[PDB]
What we know:
Belongs to the NUP153 family. It is found in: Nucleus; Nucleus membrane; Nucleus, Nuclear pore complex. It is a single chain. By secondary structure, this protein is low in regular secondary structure. The radius of gyration is 18 Å and the shape is elongated.
Amino acid sequence: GSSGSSGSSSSCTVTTGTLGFGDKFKRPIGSWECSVCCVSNNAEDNKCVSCMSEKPG
Ligand SMILES: [Zn+2]
């Protein structure tokens, strides 16, 4: 137990140490899985449809 804040607030993120891709994400070869919304997109489509974000790469 540690004190020093307003109201007990449990966190999930690792303090004093941030990581990336904590888990795996099933994505197709051709198409590309968005990151902001993580919605299916069209390889040819240089943008998203759910968030309309520019395709990475
Ligand atoms: Zn998107």
